[PDB]
Amino acid sequence: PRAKTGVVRRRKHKKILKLAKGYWGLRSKSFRKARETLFAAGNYAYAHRKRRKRDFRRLWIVRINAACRQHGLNYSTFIHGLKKAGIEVDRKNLADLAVREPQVFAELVERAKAAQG
Amino acid sequence: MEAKAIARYVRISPRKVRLVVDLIRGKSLEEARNILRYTNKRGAYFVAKVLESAAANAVNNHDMLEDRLYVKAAYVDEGPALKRVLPRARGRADIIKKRTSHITVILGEKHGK
Amino acid sequence: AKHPVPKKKTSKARRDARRSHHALTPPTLVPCPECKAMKPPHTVCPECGYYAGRKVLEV
Amino acid sequence: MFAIVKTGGKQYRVEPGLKLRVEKLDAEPGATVELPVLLLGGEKTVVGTPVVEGASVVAEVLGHGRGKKILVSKFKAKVQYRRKKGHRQPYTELLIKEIRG
Amino acid sequence: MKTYVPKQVEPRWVLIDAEGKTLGRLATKIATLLRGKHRPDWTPNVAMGDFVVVVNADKIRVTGKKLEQKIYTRYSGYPGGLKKIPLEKMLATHPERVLEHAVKGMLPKGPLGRRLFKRLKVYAGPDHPHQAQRPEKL
RNA sequence: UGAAAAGAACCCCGGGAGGGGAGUGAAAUAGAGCCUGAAACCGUGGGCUUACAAGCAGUCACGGCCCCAAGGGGUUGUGGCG
RNA sequence: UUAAGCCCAGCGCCGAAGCUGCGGGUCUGGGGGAUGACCCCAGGCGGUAGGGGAGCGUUCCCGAUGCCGAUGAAGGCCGACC
Incomplete structure (x- = not known):
């Protein structure tokens, strides 16, 4: 019984190709130029999903800081003013208040400096 | 509507005629005629003939009326090439490819308001 | 087949480019006067011809 | 009204009626009600007061027409001769319907 | 799930000059200003921020001595010479740049920071014949 | 090739070749080195996109344009990482 | 340039795929346990040469004097579905 390569492969490749559609050159026309790419693409995404997370961490701080800086205080001071006050809240993210409904934030600021009277 | 022509296995490299062709893409049949008539290339005599026949067809076969038709579209495709051996110095010998072409031309009616 | 040689297949891009x-x-x-045909500028085309100059045939 | 509840180590701000994913909960059935903690009233004509974990009893009333969702992903680690495409994570989602504050 | 995006703002300029300051110690603040780093509606990819305008150029202090101590290599023609220039020069022979450069090396390297540097508008004034809304900042 | 030559009469373009109609056939993208006809590769048309910007060509993120709508596809202008 | 340098003190932020939080996966250990392999608890899960364990497909035979099959097989080309 001679088992020909037959179909198998062709399919095995069409798959990887689809995956690499829209890429640059042979990069998306070569059963292997594609492969090699899909590899980088591999970690790239993976490594990034790890970045994205801490990407917004920072992306927010700026806001927070560049927001509560208007009320004469450091994001540094600010935060501390909370930790020693109590607030497993705000979530550097949820300090979206600094923008939408800034009055909500205001109380917080004043709330902040409070703990440091 | 539209009248086709297509003259296969011409014997002239595609790249070569594609040139005369893009020279008439979308134009008055009346004009293209003149054009090719004075375009210095070999493609001329080929795309000429064809384009001329698309006209014929257009009339004789699809009652489209000469005066109103132009060049809906036209293009050229690679045909099966003829490989030939070329004696090279120091007995190297190479295979030269006498390429071949498929000239397609499709007329169409211009307007009617 | 000798000295200077292509170091890479040229990309279909830079090729067309x-x-x-x-x-x-x-x-x-x-x-063109007489006939409502066409001729290139400064040229005597074999149909109507020129004036004071020969050409093909007419009457 | 405004409000900020915490769920799945994550905290969101909710309004008077809406929601998205939140992460699997023992709320076994779809048509069920659960109430997650709160963190800042909402400032509207009803209040606007936060506080230390704001554990002031009040919470958000949430129903939820869900069913453990998923999603594509494909996690292909890759070193060198080491490939491990052996990963598909869809992650279980839990759709909720925020009711009252 | 959340989101936090700003729509099309309206460039709110700023006229400024503290020629009693040290460029750099100033430049930064200017740059900081350039890109909307102060305005809490951040978007590093957008290109929203003050249209900063500095007047009364020079007159700028500059700490210790840069009497040819501060050199501006900046220029490298191409054949064999990397033309250097000391401060004194730029000050006398058309200044302004003095501060300009100080700002460039503070704004990000991309077509953006490139675009942001396009905002800065410094003159060897006083006098900024170019404004319709100078909101002089302190 | 097709079950079978029924393998394309006749008219038209063309010196021919090739074609366009016509006609045979279940099928002619079954028309003759003719079943099916993959890939590389060459084209035409359309959509998004590019002429101040520096790259293993992707990935993450927002924003815009194009076909169905508390979503999706396609593309990609900046930004981040490589 | 009374610093964005150096030395001596104080407080606070930032910050990794580290550790917590929430959810899912898997392998060992111990018990539940009307065994049902169906759930708790506690730990582990970077990896070349290697070692071990599970699986997926291709051709062929038994199943076949069978069952699908023109109300369309095989192969091909698409798809954001499962």
Whole structure:
């Protein structure tokens, strides 16, 4: 019984190709130029999903800081003013208040400096 | 509507005629005629003939009326090439490819308001 | 087959890119008197001909 | 009204009626009600007061027409001769319907 | 799930000059200003921020001595010479740049920071014949 | 090739070749080195996109344009990482 | 340039795929346990040469004097579905 390569492969490749559609050159026309790419693409995404997370961490701080800086205080001071006050809240993210409904934030600021009277 | 022509296995490299062709893409049949008539290339005599026949067809076969038709579209495709051996110095010998072409031309009616 | 040689297959890109300036240029023809046909400028076309100059045949 | 509840180590701000994913909960059935903690009233004509974990009893009333969702992904680690495409994570989602504050 | 995006703002300029300051110690603040780093509607990819305008150029102090101590290599023609220039020069022979450069090396390297540097508008004034809304900042 | 030559009469373009109609056939993208006809590769048309910007060509993120709508596809202008 | 340098003190932020939080996966250990392999608890899960364990497909035979099959097989080309 001679088992020909037959179909198998062709399919095995069409798959990887689809995956690499829209890429640059042979990069998306070569059963292997594609492969090699899909590899980088591999970690790239993976490594990034790890970045994205801490990407917004920072992306927010700026806001927070560049927001509560208007009320004469450091994001540094600010935060501390909370930790020693109590607030497993705000979530550097949820300090979206600094923008939408800034009055909500205001109380917080004043709330902040409070703990440091 | 539209009248086709297509003259296969011409014997002239595609790249070569594609040139005369893009020279008439979308134009008055009346004009293209003149054009090719004075375009210095070999493609001329080929795309000429064809384009001329698309006209014929257009009339004789699809009652489209000469005066109103132009060049809906036209293009050229690679045909099966003829490989030939070329004696090279120091007995190297190479295979030269006498390429071949498929000239397609499709007329169409211009307007009617 | 010798000394200087292509170091890489040229990308279909830079290939076409190189041809940008290849486009052919339509010939330049004009009305022409007698016949409502076409001829290129400064030319005697074999149909009507010229004045004071020969050509093909007419009457 | 405004409000900020915490769920799945994550905290969101909710309004008077809406929601998205939140992460699997023992709320076994779809048509069920659960109430997650709160963190800042909402400032509207009803209040606007936060506080230390704001554990002031009040919470958000949430129903939820869900069913453990998923999603594509494909996690292909890759070193060198080491490939491990052996990963498909869809992650279980839990759709909720925020009711009252 | 959340989101936090700003729509099309309206460039709110700023006229400024503290020629009693040290460029750099100033430049930064200017740059900081350039990109909307102060305005809490951040978007590093947008290109929203003050249209900063500095007047009364020079007159700028500059700490210790840069009497040819501060050199501006900046220029490298191409054949064999990397033309250097001391401060004194730029000050006398058309200044302004003095501060300009100080700002460039503070704004990000991309077509953006490139675009942001396009905002800065410094003159060897006083006099900024170019405004319709100078909101002089302190 | 097709079950079978029924393998394309006749008219038209063309010196021919090739074609366009016509006609045979279940099928002619079954028309003759003709079943099916993959890939590389060459084209035409359309959509998004590019002429101040520096790259293993992707990935993450927002924003815009194009076909169905508390979603999706396609593309990609900046930004981040490589 | 009374610093964005150096030395001596104080407080606070930032910050990794580290550790917590929430959810899912898997392998060992111990018990539940009307065994049902169906759930708790506690730990582990970077990896070349290697070692071990599970699986997926291709051709062929038994199943076949069978069952699908023109109300369309095989192969091909698409798809954001499962």
